[PDB]
Amino acid sequence: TANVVVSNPRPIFTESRSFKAVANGKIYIGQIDTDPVNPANQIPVYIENEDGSHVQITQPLIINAAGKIVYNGQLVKIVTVQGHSMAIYDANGSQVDYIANVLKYDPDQYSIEADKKFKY
Amino acid sequence: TANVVVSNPRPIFTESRSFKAVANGKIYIGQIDTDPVNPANQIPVYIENEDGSHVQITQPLIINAAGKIVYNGQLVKIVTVQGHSMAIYDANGSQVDYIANVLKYDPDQYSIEADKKFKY
Amino acid sequence: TANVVVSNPRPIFTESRSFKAVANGKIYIGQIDTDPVNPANQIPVYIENEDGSHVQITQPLIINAAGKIVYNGQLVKIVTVQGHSMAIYDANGSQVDYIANVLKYDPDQYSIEADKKFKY
Amino acid sequence: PIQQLPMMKGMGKDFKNADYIDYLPVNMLATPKEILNSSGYLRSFPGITKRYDMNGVSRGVEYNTAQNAVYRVCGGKLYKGESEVGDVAGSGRVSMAHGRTSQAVGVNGQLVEYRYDGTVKTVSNWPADSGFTQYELGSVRDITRLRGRYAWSKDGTDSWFITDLEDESHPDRYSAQYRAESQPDGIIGIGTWRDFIVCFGSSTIEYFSLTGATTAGAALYVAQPSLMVQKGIAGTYCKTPFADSYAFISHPATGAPSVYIIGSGQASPIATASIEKIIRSYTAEEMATGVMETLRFDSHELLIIHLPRHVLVYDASSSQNGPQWCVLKTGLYDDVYRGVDFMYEGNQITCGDKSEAVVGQLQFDISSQYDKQQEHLLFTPLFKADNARCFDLEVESSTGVAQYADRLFLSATTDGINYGREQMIEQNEPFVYDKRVLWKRVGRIRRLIGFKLRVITKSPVTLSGCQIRLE
Amino acid sequence: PIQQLPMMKGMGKDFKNADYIDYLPVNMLATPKEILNSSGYLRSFPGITKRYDMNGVSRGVEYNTAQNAVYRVCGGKLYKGESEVGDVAGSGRVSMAHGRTSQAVGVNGQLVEYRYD
Amino acid sequence: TTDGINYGREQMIEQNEPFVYDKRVLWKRVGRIRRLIGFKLRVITKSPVTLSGCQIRLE
Amino acid sequence: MQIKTKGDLVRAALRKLGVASDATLTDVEPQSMQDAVDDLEAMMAEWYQDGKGIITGYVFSDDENPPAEGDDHGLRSSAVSAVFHNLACRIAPDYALEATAKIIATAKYGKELLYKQTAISRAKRAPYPSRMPTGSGNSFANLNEWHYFPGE
Amino acid sequence: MQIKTKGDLVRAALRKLGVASDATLTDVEPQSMQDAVDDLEAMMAEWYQDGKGIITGYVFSDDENPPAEGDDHGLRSSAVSAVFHNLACRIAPDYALEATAKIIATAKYGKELLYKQTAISRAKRAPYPSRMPTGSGNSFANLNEWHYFPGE
Amino acid sequence: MQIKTKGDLVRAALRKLGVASDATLTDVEPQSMQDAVDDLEAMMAEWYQDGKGIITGYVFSDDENPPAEGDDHGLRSSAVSAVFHNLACRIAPDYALEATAKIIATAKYGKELLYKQTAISRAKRAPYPSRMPTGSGNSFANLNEWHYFPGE
């Protein structure tokens, strides 16, 4: 029986009106239905490395020229602790987007989740 | 323990034969393993506003120049029930895609049966 | 009155550093934490049809101009019984992307372990 | 050409039944004053900052003029100002009254009087040893004080009893019981208007005045039927003294409920159709549990109504174009306002709470509720401007006092239900007093348009003079 | 030139006596309210959905403020809310009243009081 | 109607639509008014009808 | 150039009109954008009269590939301004609009500047008539017996 | 092209007039569609004066084929803009409207550009008259006894 | 010069237009900055017709650089006023404005002065024709001579 399906995990970020990637833009994410640019509204963000070490980073997430988030020039996977409100700014500074409620769940590392939620 | 992945909201629908958005495209959302073009096989589709209220909209959702769903030229956040079928049609009636069950595309197919059969 | 944001489940593979599809690209799927380009390290892949019928396909997966996987000139979904490692190469043979572990665990062996410890 | 858009009161469509409803400002009060090309502005409701910690959530408040202090019932304890001076049973809202000798609380069907000398008494029948009458005292529903007498209402039996002049812990010696009797039932509430005991049933309000009778057994109150109001109240706390008479929420016994004010023998509705729909959204329960109250500051004469899922504030001083209602809420997701039981003492307005055992003091410099930022909304009525191509959305916002350069989410709707993208514009900044809050390029109106203009701040929001350039 | 036509009340002629009459709206209620260039709209009268099953065509209704309920005289029975409480003779519209101890119905030239006990 | 008694040809225009909140109920070409004119505007439906702002371009 | 697709051209035209841009709170529904792209295709086809009109390098979209928007227009860097100014002028009547005087002047200037180089190329002189003698001072032609110009 | 039928032409014309377009949130009444198609047929038959007028490749709908709407117009890609601009001008009076200045200018420009290539083709020069000699320079003709031009 | 970037040019244009200046109390919106930078690039490419237009020294960006604003324009000191005045004139209609008469006049004068030196340079006289003698008064000076000018 099929168990996993091949898919591209790397998210992509494009402009709201045109099919162009947001180049060198910035992402802020904070409390839901708020202004994520405010450090009083921001929430922590963790890079989930190849093993899942969850190293914490600073807030403004930089978007590559390819529409993907990077840290130190390498593609990274970013996770957060709960649903949030997100604001994407362009390279110039124009507000590309603002979403008041975002929530998609991490699909990997199920072993730990099942280990915790099941009874031995 | 960050279990929420920071990803792209407002999904992007792209041409199947070329790397271009489905401008003025149609999305039909219906019951599982049935064609959603027929109005008899469709299911309610809501839009979540800032205040959290879900307002039901007409079934064929419009895809704008960026490949993202729009309501009146404005980017919206669309929601529906967990299991549904998608049929994405082009402007001239061409069939861009047909996904019979959207749940059968999550990378972790094992977790479904695991969480369904193992006791908590 | 809804719980899941409407999204596009079909994967699309864009390039790592610039915004364009991996036209005429290659996907290789192999054993976890190894280089899948080696046929010794290679594992099998199945085209999961719309009704769920599985057929075996040869490993090097061709990615068309739209960034999508096709076998008989049609969009397909690829599944594997175990966890895997995914390497994506462009049309010039450069390594666009590499993931050593795509769900951070192997559902095949973890299925046997779970059946042997977790209560029924 | 320039067009001025009113913001005090917007319009919209309700998608439950596709009706035309009103959009009321959230956490905003309309202050009518000619500033500049405006004739009125809108200001955030004063914020709540912690003053005291108490035993529980508030259950009743009064201003004991005999002890010139605010008496409050938080949790199971009783407070004269700050210090605890008694204990109260039960957990629901309690009635309060006071006199020269004691402070009386109606709780658990009892009239419990905490005397200022430290003795806790309870209203009960005279001992059978007396040559005095025995009355059939039931459960106490509401109490009031008048002319050195506590008047309390029996539970659901039309009857009300007044205490004895020189022994306040017992009913009157010879004539303590009275009835409405121009009615089949109802003693839902009791109050005192000027010198009249006012008995609010369901579908009637009765007035009684002192007879002056001196002989034994003669009645000490006579109904004045010339002032009867043919409308009732929904619950026991669905009435408060507003202007010179009471304001109440009518009972289902006389049609669909709405907010009325006693005139002179008649009631004049105060609620608009939208407030009427909001009230109609509740059953007879969750409507009998509503709590009305009043507040007054800076000429603002507010009547506040708390329901399980709403807080509606009616500003009587700024109702020159019709009733002016606003919605008060806590948080970003229409959670019910937490402040309750406002009373002005000294030079500060102090308020209780609904969810924590705290008492706050209504600071005017801030707008945050217990250091929590609040969401402020201001909707503009829909209008038909086919092919208008609007530009230069300007608002004159009073800036300067802030902790951060807080922004404002501006958005527009085309059908009155769903709103478009939200653009953040700096509406304020610390220690700058000239800002020009403005968005240059608004879109093109196809058929209709409306604006949202939401603000989330820890600082006051003062907005006026909303204008657009419609070309 | 754009001209607004009032809709709250039409006009016409009666083809029997050729007299001018007002055409009244059917199943529509006019709500005065400034929406947009209108100063009033018109809404359909709310619809009727089945709630209960009485015994016959309704012969009276009243709101008892003592029992805090609605008493319907439908068919030959008498209902407090939904449940039958008594029996009523006759087949026409009846008078209703209520007091401290009884709900009284005037029917067939008789004043018949149904007490709550 | 041109006399207020007998009404003329009836035209069917969509006045509502499920989950469509922008409709523009509008008839483009009315005729020429000879002496008088009145309109009927009849709806048979199972859903609420809200109508306001009847306007017309008279030239 | 940031304007690289037919839809980018249309978006620039609409922004010049003031109907819709990235800053506006209301946007045109994608059927309007598709109509504008059809207008642009019709205008460009009318300009380029099957090879005998204005040469721009514009690539006409093919019906097989479905979305015209998203196709690169192929124009040079110097024709984009002219093309989208003319497009704003042409699709102004849809929105009950009239392009402003500056937009009309820029449209005229851009169209003329577009045809300038092709006009310079097409300004050519016809060969000598068939009845024109070659001349006895040409030596080579006299010796080759080519005394008259061929012509045509 | 995306304008391939008489219905496409009519919808484009009505959108230009602002009668039936999504930017106006209206849609085409079928009666208006029929009337506009009839106007287009009459106008096209008037332009193409049975071969002696403007040639565009327009395919007139024969009587038998019941719905004239839905058929391909047959025009080339360079005539569509002119055709629907002039159709908008023609059918504006039905609504007591008046096509705006830009629409009228584009109609004129399109009609002129439509006739340009036919005018170039029809600018032919008449043959020599029957009384013109061929001259003695035409040695082949004067040797084959062709002394005068035929004419006609 | 205190104006050494495309952003500085755009800011000067907006300040002239009265849209975003400290003379008023408005601030520059990033959407306005981006749109005006795109307009400046398009206008400069239109002017500089791939070398056969107005030569100014303007440096055209590339897709590799993400923010177009922030780069030096490269213009000489005497071109900045003309550039930003014409930019203000071009981007005025986006806000339903019309640049005032002073701005229009200054833009005309600046463009003229921009092309003055190029005009003086290009006003060149073509060499002698191919069929022109060089004179008998030349050969004695240059014993080799040629009798006729080469041409071209």
Gap between the Cα atoms of A17 and A97, Å rounded: 10
**Nearest Cα to Cα of residue H110 among H89, H88, H79:** H79
- CB–CB contact F19 B72 (8 Å): no
| Rounded (10°) CA dihedral D69, D71, D77, D83 | -10
First to last CA, chain B: 21
- CB–CB contact F55 E3 (8 Å): yes
CB G12 within 8 A of CB G86: no
G103 closest CB neighbour out of I42, I49, I93: I93
Residue F40, token pair as written in the block: 């009927």
Gap between the Cα atoms of D201 and D191, Å rounded: 12
Residue H35's H or E segment, with its range, is: helix H30-47
Say yes or no: D446 contacts chain H, CB-CB below 8 A.
yes
| DSSP codes of every residue in D226-277 | GG-BS---SSTTSEEE-SSSEEEE--TBTBS--EEEE-SSSEEE---HHHHH
Residue H17, token pair as written in the block: 């007039």
F44's CB contacts (< 8 A; 6+ apart) are none
SS3 D63: strand
Residue H55, token pair as written in the block: 């040639």
Gap between the Cα atoms of D43 and D33, Å rounded: 12
> Looking at beta carbons, which residues of chain G come within 8 Å of I92?
102
- CB–CB contact G94 H18 (8 Å): yes
Gap between the Cα atoms of I4 and H143, Å rounded: 82
Residues of chain E in Cβ contact (below 8 Å) with chain D: 31, 33, 35-37, 41, 43, 63-66, 68, 98-100
Determine whether B105 is exposed, middle or buried from the number of CB atoms within 10 Å of its CB (0-12, 13-18, 19+). middle
Gap between the Cα atoms of D97 and D113, Å rounded: 9
Q: Which residue of F has its CA nearest to E29?
A: F50
Gap between the Cα atoms of C107 and B117, Å rounded: 15
Helix axes I6-17, I30-47, angle to 10 degrees: 110
Name beta bridge partners: B61: B27
CA D296, D397, D407, B66 torsion: positive or negative? positive
Determine whether D416 is exposed, middle or buried from the number of CB atoms within 10 Å of its CB (0-12, 13-18, 19+). buried
CA angle B25, B31, B32 (to 5 degrees): 105
Gap between the Cα atoms of H124 and H120, Å rounded: 8
SS3 A21: strand
SS3 A29: strand
Residue A72, token pair as written in the block: 């130190």
SS3 E107: strand
Tokens 């495209």 belong to residue: B25
> Looking at beta carbons, which residues of chain D come within 8 Å of B51?
333-334
CB D276 within 8 A of CB D288: no
B abuts E (3+ Cβ pairs < 8 Å): no
Say yes or no: G34 contacts chain I, CB-CB below 8 A.
no
For I118, phi then psi, to 5°, come to -65, -40
CA G19, G20, G25, G27 torsion: positive or negative? positive
| DSSP codes of every residue in D273-313 | HHHHHHHHTS-STTTTT-EEEEEEETTEEEEEEEETTEEEE
SS3 H121: helix
Question: Quick one: three-class SS letters along chain B?
Answer: CCCEECCCCCCCCECCCCCCECCCEEEEEECCCCCCCCHHHECCCEEECCCCCEEECCCCEEECCCCCEECCCCECCEEECCCCEEEEECCCCCEEEEECCHHHHCCECHHHHHHHHCCC
Residue D272, token pair as written in the block: 């608009």
SS3 D29: strand
Gap between the Cα atoms of D250 and D271, Å rounded: 11
CB H20 within 8 A of CB G60: no
For D430, phi then psi, to 5°, come to -65, 130
F21 closest CB neighbour out of D17, D20, D417: D417
Gap between the Cα atoms of G87 and G99, Å rounded: 10
Residue D104, token pair as written in the block: 């009386």
To test the contact with chain A by mutation, choose from B1, B5, B14, B77 the residue with the greatest count of A C-beta atoms within 10 A, namely B5
CB neighbours of residue E81 within 10 Å: 12
- CB–CB contact A35 D423 (8 Å): no
CB E5 within 8 A of CB E22: no
Residue A111's H or E segment, with its range, is: helix A110-117
CA E6, E10, E11, E12 torsion: positive or negative? positive
| DSSP codes of every residue in chain I | ----SHHHHHHHHHHHHTSS-TTTT----HHHHHHHHHHHHHHHHHHS-TTSS----PPP--TTSS-STTS-----TTTHHHHHHHHHHHHGGGGT----HHHHHHHHHHHHHHHHHHHHHH-------TT-B--HHHHTTSTT--SB----
Contacts of B49-54 spanning 24+ positions with Cβ under 8 A: B49/D418, B49/D419, B50/A33, B50/A100, B50/D409, B50/D411, B50/D419, B50/D422, B50/D454, B51/D333, B51/D334, B52/A101, B52/D333, B54/B79, B54/C1, B54/C2
Min distance F31 CA to chain B CA atoms (Å): 34
D407's CB contacts (< 8 A; 6+ apart) are A35, A37, D424, D425, D426, D427
Gap between the Cα atoms of G60 and D376, Å rounded: 51
I32's CB contacts (< 8 A; 6+ apart) are D440, D441, G23, I14, I19, I20
- CB–CB contact D418 B76 (8 Å): yes
SS3 D94: coil
SS3 C102: coil
Residue C16, token pair as written in the block: 């790592």
- CB–CB contact F29 H95 (8 Å): yes
Gap between the Cα atoms of D364 and D46, Å rounded: 5
DSSP structural state of residue H143: H
Say yes or no: H1 contacts chain G, CB-CB below 8 A.
yes
Starting at the edge strand found earlier in the chain, the sheet holding A4-5 runs A4-5, C78-80, C45-48, C54-57
For D166, phi then psi, to 5°, come to -105, -5
Say yes or no: G29 contacts chain A, CB-CB below 8 A.
no
Gap between the Cα atoms of C63 and C69, Å rounded: 5
Residue type, G149: F
CB F51 within 8 A of CB E33: no
Q: Which residue of G has its CA nearest to B92?
A: G66
CB D67 within 8 A of CB D116: yes
Gap between the Cα atoms of D236 and D217, Å rounded: 30
B108's CB contacts (< 8 A; 6+ apart) are A4, A107, A108, A110, C103, C107
Chains D & G: contacts with CB separation below 8 Å: 43
**Nearest Cα to Cα of residue C48 among C86, C76, C84:** C76
CB neighbours of residue C31 within 10 Å: 18
Say yes or no: D389 contacts chain H, CB-CB below 8 A.
no
Determine whether H56 is exposed, middle or buried from the number of CB atoms within 10 Å of its CB (0-12, 13-18, 19+). buried
> Looking at beta carbons, which residues of chain I come within 8 Å of G89?
none
**Nearest Cα to Cα of residue H4 among H84, H117, H105:** H84
Q: How far is CA D39 from CA B33, D296, F33, G56, in A?
A: 61, 21, 46, 58
Q: How far is CA B50 from CA C5, D85, D334, E112, in A?
A: 15, 47, 12, 60
Gap between the Cα atoms of A22 and A8, Å rounded: 19
To test the contact with chain F by mutation, choose from D383, D415, D445 the residue with the greatest count of F C-beta atoms within 10 A, namely D415
Min distance C103 CA to chain A CA atoms (Å): 4
For D429, phi then psi, to 5°, come to -160, 145
> Looking at beta carbons, which residues of chain E come within 8 Å of F39?
5
Name beta bridge partners: E74: E58, E77
Looking at chain B, how many residues does it have?
120
- CB–CB contact I69 A24 (8 Å): no
| DSSP codes of every residue in F8-59 | ----------TT--------S-----SS----------SS--EE---EEE--
Residue B8, token pair as written in the block: 């792209």
Name beta bridge partners: A28: A87
Query: E strands within E1-117?
Result: 2-4, 10-14, 19-23, 28-31, 41-44, 58-64, 69-74, 77-80, 83-87, 95-98, 102-107, 110-115
- CB–CB contact G22 A17 (8 Å): yes
- CB–CB contact D441 G27 (8 Å): no
- CB–CB contact F18 B58 (8 Å): yes
G134's CB contacts (< 8 A; 6+ apart) are G141, G142, G146, G147, G148, G149
**Nearest Cα to Cα of residue A72 among A85, A55, A86, A94:** A55
Q: How far is CA D191 from CA D165, D293, F29, in A?
A: 19, 14, 65
> Looking at beta carbons, which residues of chain F come within 8 Å of B72?
22
CB C69 within 8 A of CB C48: no
I137's CB contacts (< 8 A; 6+ apart) are none
CA H17, H23, H27, H33 torsion: positive or negative? positive
Question: Quick one: three-class SS letters along D104-145?
Answer: EEEECCEEEEEECCCCEEECCCCCCCCCCCCCCCCCEEEEEE
I abuts G (3+ Cβ pairs < 8 Å): yes
**Nearest Cα to Cα of residue E96 among E83, D252, D201, E74:** E74
Determine whether D279 is exposed, middle or buried from the number of CB atoms within 10 Å of its CB (0-12, 13-18, 19+). buried
Say yes or no: G147 contacts chain I, CB-CB below 8 A.
no
Residue H26, token pair as written in the block: 């209206």
Residue type, D286: E
Name beta bridge partners: C106: none
B4 closest CB neighbour out of A3, A69, A103: A103
Gap between the Cα atoms of I145 and D115, Å rounded: 137
Residue C54, token pair as written in the block: 């599985």
To test the contact with chain B by mutation, choose from G5, G15, G69, G71 the residue with the greatest count of B C-beta atoms within 10 A, namely G69
CA angle H44, H46, H52 (to 5 degrees): 105
For C4, phi then psi, to 5°, come to -130, 130
SS3 D458: coil
What's chain H's Rg over C-alpha atoms? 23
Residue H65, token pair as written in the block: 């084929």
CA B33, B38, B44, B47 torsion: positive or negative? positive
Determine whether H86 is exposed, middle or buried from the number of CB atoms within 10 Å of its CB (0-12, 13-18, 19+). buried
This structure's resolution (angstroms)? 3.1
CB D133 within 8 A of CB D149: no
Residue D368, token pair as written in the block: 């945050």
Longest CA pairwise span in chain B (Å): 50
> Looking at beta carbons, which residues of chain I come within 8 Å of D438?
26
**Nearest Cα to Cα of residue A64 among C15, H108, E102:** C15
To test the contact with chain G by mutation, choose from I6, I37, I46, I59 the residue with the greatest count of G C-beta atoms within 10 A, namely I46
DSSP structural state of residue C42: B
**Nearest Cα to Cα of residue I39 among G106, F55, G136, D98:** G106
DSSP structural state of residue D430: B
F52 closest CB neighbour out of E10, E15, E38: E38
Gap between the Cα atoms of G51 and B90, Å rounded: 31
Burial of G121-136, coded b for 16+ CB within 10 Å and e otherwise, reads: eeeeeeeeeeeeebee
First to last CA, chain A: 25
A abuts C (3+ Cβ pairs < 8 Å): yes
CB B13 within 8 A of CB B20: no
Question: Quick one: three-class SS letters along chain G?
Answer: CCCCEHHHHHHHHHHHHCCCCCCCCCCCCHHHHHHHHHHHHHHHHHHCCCCCCCCCCCCCCCCCCCCCCCCECCCCCCCHHHHHHHHHHHHHHHHCCCCCHHHHHHHHHHHHHHHHHHHHHHCCCCCCCCCCECCHHHCHHHHCCCCECCCC
| Rounded (10°) CA dihedral D294, D295, D301, D307 | -50
- Chains touching chain A at 3 or more Cβ pairs under 8 angstroms? B, C, D, G, I
Structure-solving method: cryo-EM
Q: Which residue of H has its CA nearest to F26?
A: H26
SS3 E108: coil
Where residue F4 falls (left for φ over 0; alpha for ψ -120 to 50; beta otherwise) is left
| Rounded (10°) CA dihedral G30, G34, G40, G46 | -160
